[PDB]
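testing teh design pipeline on a random one, pls ignore if ur not involved
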């Protein structure tokens, strides 16, 4: 689900597209796997149209 770009100042290894699930009625994000650990894949883009 949604891929969030992360830019960390002063920290290494926390950069990456985090998987986020958003329900706007609550206004928060459900954690993927119950953690905020970075995912793999680097910075892949699927759809060219923006």
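output:
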């Amino acid at each position: 689900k949604y891929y969030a770009k992360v830019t960390v100042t002063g920290g290494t290894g926390k950069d990456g597209y985090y998987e986020v699930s958003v329900d706007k009625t609550n206004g928060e994000v459900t954690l993927a796997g119950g953690a905020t650990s970075p995912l793999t894949g680097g910075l892949p883009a699927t759809a060219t149209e923006d």
